[PDB]
Amino acid sequence: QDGEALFKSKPCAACHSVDTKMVGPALKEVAAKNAGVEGAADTLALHIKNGSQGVWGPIPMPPNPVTEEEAKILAEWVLSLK
């Protein structure tokens, strides 16, 4: 309740997903990509605010209105997804 709920209010669900997918790699598939790199939370923060591409597909992710506070938490729950 201190990590998943945030993903809800966060439009990250509109594009990303938890047990499926639509545009970007579901945090589940992404968690496995940055799993070995548990310290990937810092790299994601730079890929979320300034968007990022080539890491998954030719679809650059538009910058989202997220700060370091929400970007950090959301990054902690995404890494703890599984």
**DSSP states of 48-80:** HTT---SSSSS-PPPP-S--HHHHHHHHHHHHH
Q: Is 78 flagged in the annotation as binding?
A: no
Q: Is 22 flagged in the annotation as binding?
A: no
Identify which of residues 1 and 16 has a Cβ nearer to ligand HEC in the complex: 16
C-alpha distances in angstroms, 71 versus 38, 43, 58, 59? 15, 11, 23, 20
Three-state SS at 40: helix
One of 19, 54, 69, 82 touching ligand HEC (CB under 6 A)? 54
Residue 11 Cβ vs ligand HEC, minimum distance, rounded to whole Å: 5
Binding site residue list for heme c = 12, 15-16, 61
Which residues bind to ligand HEC, rule: CB under 6 A? Answer: 10-12, 14-16, 23-24, 30, 44, 47-48, 52-57, 59, 61-62, 64, 66, 74
